[PDB]
Design a protein around this nucleic acid. Structure first.
Ligand SMILES: *[C@@H]1O[C@H](CO)[C@@H](O[C@@H]2O[C@H](CO)[C@@H](O)[C@H](O)[C@H]2NC(C)=O)[C@H](O)[C@H]1NC(C)=O
Ligand SMILES: *[C@@H]1O[C@H](CO)[C@@H](O[C@@H]2O[C@H](CO)[C@@H](O)[C@H](O)[C@H]2NC(C)=O)[C@H](O)[C@H]1NC(C)=O
Ligand code: IDQ
Ligand code: IDQ
Ligand code: NAG
Ligand code: NAG
Ligand code: NAG
Ligand code: NAG
Ligand code: NAG
Ligand code: NAG
Ligand code: NAG
Ligand code: NAG
Ligand code: NAG
Ligand code: NAG
Ligand code: NAG
Ligand code: NAG
Lengths: 775, 774
RNA sequence: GUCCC
RNA sequence: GUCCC
């Protein structure tokens, strides 16, 4: 169907709207720019390769380039792979870019460059030099950048990439970059704000440096500035998981009261980890548009109880005051200033790491009439006491987050303590939707009763994951939660003695009781898995990793359940050969469409398992079972089966004729098995098939009878990589078909490979020339 | 060093004291008996193979066989592999055993046999026919067994191997087996005790059958019987994890009051799962020697409060009354009869599954003066309340077991609920420190010193699997002045204070594994230098804690010999460019064993090895995804004896091992990506004694890499599952493997050529390379 | 591949 | 293969 096979080891995409020819060679183990890149290429990505040099030959024919992404072909040693260290810094010979008359974006991050590359064309708008070894900025090296708008220079001198000196910037180095809008000098050992900066700046990043003082005129001319980040100058170093040097004498970053007066457009001010003890109101006199203020990791514990500056912030959207606790102090309560009541626009308030014992309703009163408040984050506070009923005054909120506390009767897991939360990777550049969420995960709740939730009937999602709840539920414990749609009960010690557990939650749509294995791990104890009958609108049930090997009831029943996750249990024991009692465990889940019984140690499936499946089953996973055999003809019982996942097993054969096993099957996943050959008529007349994964098997040969053309051209995707293809003359049809097909087959360039014979070992089949088979 | 390579795919051993030649072909994927078995073989084991028949040719030459173990060459379908099902039952041709004039033991279990094989020699003492399809025993088929002493016929008719009829035994079938001592008819669908049995019987196994009634004379003549097991006749079926049919009408197994009167020698009586509601004292009138009584899984809840029969058991050593609870009843307390006080000899008492809310000191008083009592097991009782101080009255005990309860302020994990605890396979802990209180798997959320009042005698305390989410500061275990072992795993320890555990001044072993909770939340203080105060601590386990951060930079101890640090995040702690924790273990000055496997260490930053403590002997770096390894840094480890690098991604070995470590004895490199050895790999590495290179991708090994003066002082050399290329370049290695005295496992099954073409899949031990010498 | 799984 | 790991 193709006349010219594509052999370039890069993905090529056409977006004819934007006249873009997109060539993506990311992570192709290239040691040179491959030949044959399209002459019309506009976006070329070569990030993560080991191309040791650039020269005028590099992009000779590619005059239409608007973007070159040439990152991380020589990453600094501590930042890069230790198994494939870059032996030499990238070399850029003269004139490699001056021909690129339309080049607007150049990324040379992560190449151990020692200087700002010269000869760049005046069309350039974005230059990125992060994670190089450039630590002295001279005005002369910048004259070439007259039209630059975006300039990334950070991560060139810090602990993961040291330069052993202070960063140097010549006076007015940037002043004549009259279009410069974004300047990033983060993570660079900078000691002062460089001046004078061009007044076109909209975003200025100076965080993670060694700036001890702001001069009162450092930002005098920046009347267009919208984002300013000075964080991590005079850091708060307690429990830092990176080497951290504080300013002497516990001093804060010193900011004159009038330092921000020019910044009338400022929307984002980030003052994280500046060891601040006070926030002067005078800072915000002329900033009336501020929307985001980060004051986390300072020493503002007492200031939070005073906080006059909040009176100047009526348009603030987000406020972060996390991790301001005084060292070795466990306060009795949280003292929030009445001034918080003037934050009329506030949507998001975070005060993690304040560290206090008892939360009481009146302490949140400054927040009662914040009418736009959506998120209240009081996580990681070691709170021991909290009457949850107090949140009856907060029904307008979307998320109340008390995660990680000690209460008893979506940010990354590293967030406040990582070095640079916004740093780029070499590679690239949850129940809230249900309604009001109370997040009590990772607390010390050992026993629950109905009155714990009094006045919380508005809740839609309750997260109790990771508490200590070791209790037989009998339907009395959640009685006030009449509107709850989602309960996360995972990582507790549920004791399913009663089939009435959870039945008070009459609107429940999703229940997670995964990782409640404790009572399932002790022999002779009663478990009622038929508790589903009472939950009349339950759509999704997760009971993964419960180690379930026994059940007192023999059937689960539901008129509503659509999805059951049963991964990580012991159906192999429940379905012990000769024991027929549980072969219909799921049969009466009459609306069940999705069943995950992967990781159940099912080395074989006893007869009756498929007949015992509920009638509308569409999506079945049997992955990661150590399955060693499979009677494909039993799929005939699964009359609505569309997706079958058999990945990561030990199958050695496929059925003689897939179409004779299932008339409905669309998606067949067989990756990571032990298959060495296909049957002669494998896919004959399998007209419903749309997706086939045979990757990571041991296939040597595929003949045309197995893969008829009228089935292949209906496939959305066919995965074949990481097999054991033998590239002899017996393989001519398969090699020809692979080279010429339009069917999507991923990894042709790197993992659809010959293992033999001798000559062709390690060769991609897409490049294979078999003319000698036709002489 | 050998003149004749052994190519027989079986292990052959000589024990010349007993004139035994032991040939073990277990699980060799054989489809025939191999030729060339030693003519002098006395023990031949062929278990787990697919040999479809036996004939006079089978053992022609093996006149000296005393034992044939030919089990499981055709196992019943529900018991056997579904990926390699046996297609047809083992065929035994006539005259196959009659020549075996010295044969004393024949195991034919698991072969789908339909009848008792005939033509067996008169020397036979033991015959085993378990897991076949023999369900009718006729006296004529047993005449050949005149001299038999041990006869195993069980598992021929039960739910994993049905016969669809009742088992049949002819009247007096066994009577003329005048030397028969052990008879097992378990798991067989038997409906009555077969009579008359020979009076030589010492052991009679009739459990897991369908016997509804004992006749008063069923055991009349059995005056030598020492073990009788009638369990699982009229089973208690509640929560049975196997298909279970109870006797009709809720009846127990019906046993007349005098049924045991002849059994004067009886030592073991097993009446597990007989749905008994009463235990008549009259049963034990004439049994004065009984030592073991199993009454678990009956309905004896009310009998336990009465139990007059215990007065007749002054020599009982072991008593099991577990799982006798009444259905749907949660008793307030445990009512133990005073009659328990007459069990003068009792060492072991187990009452799991009695099911009661509150354990109370006076409830145990009948046990106060049982002076040989060693184990009290009250696990799985859903006890909510128990003052632990009550065990001040039980300091003589070795184990107090309250595991699996709900207390708050060594039997397998399947035991009382498995179908047959004693069934055979086809193929075949802190008590030692002293008084042990097992509180594992309860609901303890908070501990304080008074919880342990009067328990200073305890040597081992098990708190694993509780709910303890608490900062310890050294005040919580003050009375436990003698404790040597604390299992604190699977809780939520909060190491805020470096004074944690310092009150346990006799502590030698501390397990705080799987206390990851407080370690996985960022910004929290953790004091890993808490070891400094524990002056006699030998072993510390802190596996699976997800430790990625620490407030202190060094752990210190003068005593610790063993640290288990598996399943943490030293990769994050030792982030490249952060030097602060590179001496975390340096000041564990007596540390000999360090397990830092499963730490995501894809590389080791420079300084990790210099930071190791000086006496390190045994280092595991397994399961780290290690991609590179600067072998020369092993020079820092001057006492290193064992290095475990298994399950990583290493691709090379050092150019010269001897230049990396003068001390290294054991190098484990299995499951890596090594494709070739360096030219002089083991040159002059005379200290090396154990080398595991299995499951790599080695194609070729030459003598320069593997000098012989090093190889033959190796206790073991593991090479299986590689990618050996068997060309004429391999002539030295093939010869050396064929002729070496060094132990190399799996030669018969996984030391294999992958090429070239001709030799693919061929064992290197069988390889003939004469064409390389033409 | 008799119990486990 | 810049932050994660
Ligand atoms: C940031 O700059 C400081 C100096 O301003 C560097 O510190 C010097 O480091 C050298 C070599 O490590 C020492 O010999 C000097 O004594 C240091 N000088 C001072 C004034 O402390 C520091 O190394 C730089 N940081 C990074 C990450 O490169
Ligand atoms: C044990 O023996 C009983 C009979 O005593 C078997 O039960 C019969 O089984 C067949 C086939 O399942 C039925 O058609 C009969 O109706 C049954 N009869 C009665 C009276 O139950 C039973 O199958 C045997 N058990 C085993 C494990 O083989
Ligand atoms: C060995 C006992 C098997 C049956 C069982 N299972 C459980 C269980 N999963 N949780 C319990 C929790 C508290 C008390 C008893 C049980 C219990 N029990 C005992 C029990 C169950 C039910 C009742 C009636 N509420 C009384 C007692
Ligand atoms: C964001 C807090 C980091 C420091 C820290 N770590 C912990 C910890 N591991 N457990 C605690 C348990 C209770 C109270 C406070 C802490 C605590 N804290 C705060 C704290 C620690 C110590 C003290 C003095 N007892 C008071 C307060
Ligand atoms: C291509 O490059 C241009 C110029 O920098 C950029 O605006 C655009 O987003 C890029 N598109 C893709 C798909 O890489
Ligand atoms: C809260 O703290 C502020 C400042 O420390 C103080 O003005 C105020 O009185 C305190 N309020 C309470 C209730 O402690
Ligand atoms: C919690 O507050 C609610 C609502 O104000 C009140 O009804 C209840 O008494 C309080 N509960 C406790 C245990 O203090
Ligand atoms: C509940 O919180 C846990 C623990 O933080 C989290 O992993 C989980 O995704 C949350 N569940 C939902 C449904 O948001
Ligand atoms: C359920 O248990 C709760 C808590 O023990 C109790 O208040 C209630 O009486 C029980 N209800 C039923 C119907 O058993
Ligand atoms: C669940 O099954 C048990 C029988 O094992 C029965 O007692 C109970 O009533 C059932 N419950 C429901 C809700 O079906
Ligand atoms: C089938 O279910 C799996 C969950 O295991 C899901 O990830 C996948 O997208 C589903 N596929 C289809 C085609 O619905
Ligand atoms: C499978 O193929 C045979 C032969 O064409 C046909 O008789 C049979 O009905 C088919 N079965 C199914 C389930 O398609
Ligand atoms: C060898 O066979 C004899 C005869 O049954 C037996 O007594 C002995 O224990 C067996 N030893 C081994 C190691 O198989
Ligand atoms: C403590 O009990 C646990 C849980 O039953 C068990 O796994 C562990 O081996 C015990 N510890 C010791 C030291 O015996
Ligand atoms: C440790 O905590 C206990 C618990 O209340 C307390 O009695 C004791 O004073 C504390 N010890 C120290 C040294 O702080
Ligand atoms: C452990 O280190 C911390 C500081 O990192 C110190 O406060 C504490 O006293 C030390 N404790 C011991 C036992 O060394």
């Amino acid at each position: 169907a193709r006349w010219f096979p594509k052999t370039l080891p890069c993905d090529v995409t056409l977006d004819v709207s934007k006249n873009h020819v997109i060539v993506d060679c990311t992570d192709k183990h290239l040691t040179e720019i491959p030949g044959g890149i399209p002459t019309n290429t506009t976006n070329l990505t070569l990030t993560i390769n080991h191309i040791p040099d650039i020269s005028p030959a590099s992009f000779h024919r590619l005059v239409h380039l608007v973007e070159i992404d040439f990152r991380c072909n020589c990453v600094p040693i501590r930042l890069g792979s230790k198994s494939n260290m870059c032996p030499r810094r990238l070399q850029i010979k003269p004139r490699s870019f001056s021909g690129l008359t339309y080049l607007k974006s150049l990324y040379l991050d992560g190449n151990q460059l020692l200087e700002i590359p010269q000869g760049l064309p005046p069309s350039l708008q974005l230059l990125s030099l992060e994670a190089n070894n450039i630590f002295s900025i001279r005005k002369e090296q910048l004259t070439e950048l007259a039209n630059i708008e975006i300039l990334y220079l950070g991560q060139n001198c810090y602990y993961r990439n040291p330069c052993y000196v202070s960063y140097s910037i010549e006076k007015d180095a940037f002043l004549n970059l009259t279009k410069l809008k974004v300047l990033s000098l983060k993570d660079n050992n900078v000691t002062t704000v460089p001046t004078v900066l061009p007044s076109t700046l909209t975003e200025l990043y100076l965080y993670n440096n060694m700036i001890a003082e702001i001069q009162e005129d450092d930002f005098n001319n920046l009347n267009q500035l919208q984002i300013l980040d000075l964080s991590g100058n005079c850091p708060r170093c307690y429990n830092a998981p990176f080497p951290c040097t504080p300013c002497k004498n516990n001093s804060p970053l010193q900011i004159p009261v009038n330092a921000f007066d020019a910044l009338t457009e400022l929307k984002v001010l980030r003052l994280h980890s500046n060891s601040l003890q006070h926030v002067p109101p005078r800072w915000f006199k002329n900033i009336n548009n501020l929307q985001e203020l980060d004051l986390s990791q300072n020493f503002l514990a007492k200031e939070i109880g005073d906080a006059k500056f909040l009176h100047f912030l009526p348009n603030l959207i987000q406020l972060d005051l996390s991790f301001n606790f005084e060292l070795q102090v466990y306060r009795a309560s949280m003292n929030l200033s009445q001034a918080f009541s003037s934050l009329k626009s506030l949507k998001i308030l975070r005060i993690r790491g304040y560290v206090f014992k008892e939360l009481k309703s009146f302490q949140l009163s400054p927040l009662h009439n914040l009418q736009n408040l959506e998120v209240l984050d009081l996580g990681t506070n070691f709170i021991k006491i909290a009457n949850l009923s107090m949140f009856k005054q907060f029904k307008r909120l979307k998320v109340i987050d008390l995660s990680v506390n000690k209460i008893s009767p979506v940010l990354e897991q590293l967030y406040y303590f990582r070095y640079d939360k916004y740093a780029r990777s070499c590679r690239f550049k949850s129940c809230y939707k249900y309604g009001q969420t109370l997040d009590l995960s990772k607390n010390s709740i050992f026993f629950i009763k109905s009155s714990d939730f009094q006045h919380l009937s508005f809740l839609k999602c309750l997260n109790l994951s990771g508490n200590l709840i070791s209790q037989t539920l009998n339907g009395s414990e959640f009685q006030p939660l009449a509107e709850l749609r989602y309960l996360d009960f995972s990582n507790n010690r549920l004791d399913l003695l009663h089939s009435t557990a959870f039945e008070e939650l009459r609107k429940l749509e999703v229940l997670d009781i995964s990782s409640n294995s404790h009572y399932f791990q002790s022999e002779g104890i009663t478990h009622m898995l038929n508790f589903t009958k009472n939950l009349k609108v339950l759509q999704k049930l997760m009971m993964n990793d419960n180690d379930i090997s026994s059940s007192t009831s023999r059937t689960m029943e539901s008129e509503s359940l659509r999805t059951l996750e049963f991964r990580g249990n012991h159906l192999d024991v429940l379905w012990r050969d000769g024991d027929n009692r549980y072969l219909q465990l799921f049969k009466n889940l009459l609306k069940l469409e999705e069943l995950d019984i992967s990781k159940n140690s099912l080395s074989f499936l006893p007869s009756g398992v498929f007949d015992g499946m509920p009638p509308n089953l569409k999506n079945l996973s049997l992955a990661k079972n150590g399955l060693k055999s499979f009677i494909w003809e039993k799929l005939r019982y699964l009359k609505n089966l569309e997706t079958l996942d058999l990945s990561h097993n030990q199958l050695t054969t496929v059925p003689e004729r897939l179409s004779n096993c299932s008339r409905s099957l669309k998606n067949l996943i067989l990756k990571n098995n032990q298959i060495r050959s296909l049957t002669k008529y494998f896919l004959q007349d399998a007209f419903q098939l749309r997706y086939l994964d045979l990757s990571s098997n041991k296939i040597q040969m595929i003949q045309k009878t197995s893969f008829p053309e009228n089935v292949l051209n209906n496939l959305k995707m066919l995965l074949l990589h990481h097999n054991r293809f033998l590239c002899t003359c017996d393989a001519v049809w398969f090699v020809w078909w692979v080279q010429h097909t339009e069917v999507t087959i991923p990894y042709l360039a790197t993992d659809v490979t010959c293992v033999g014979p001798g000559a062709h070992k390690g060769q991609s089949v897409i490049s294979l020339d078999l003319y000698t088979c036709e002489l």
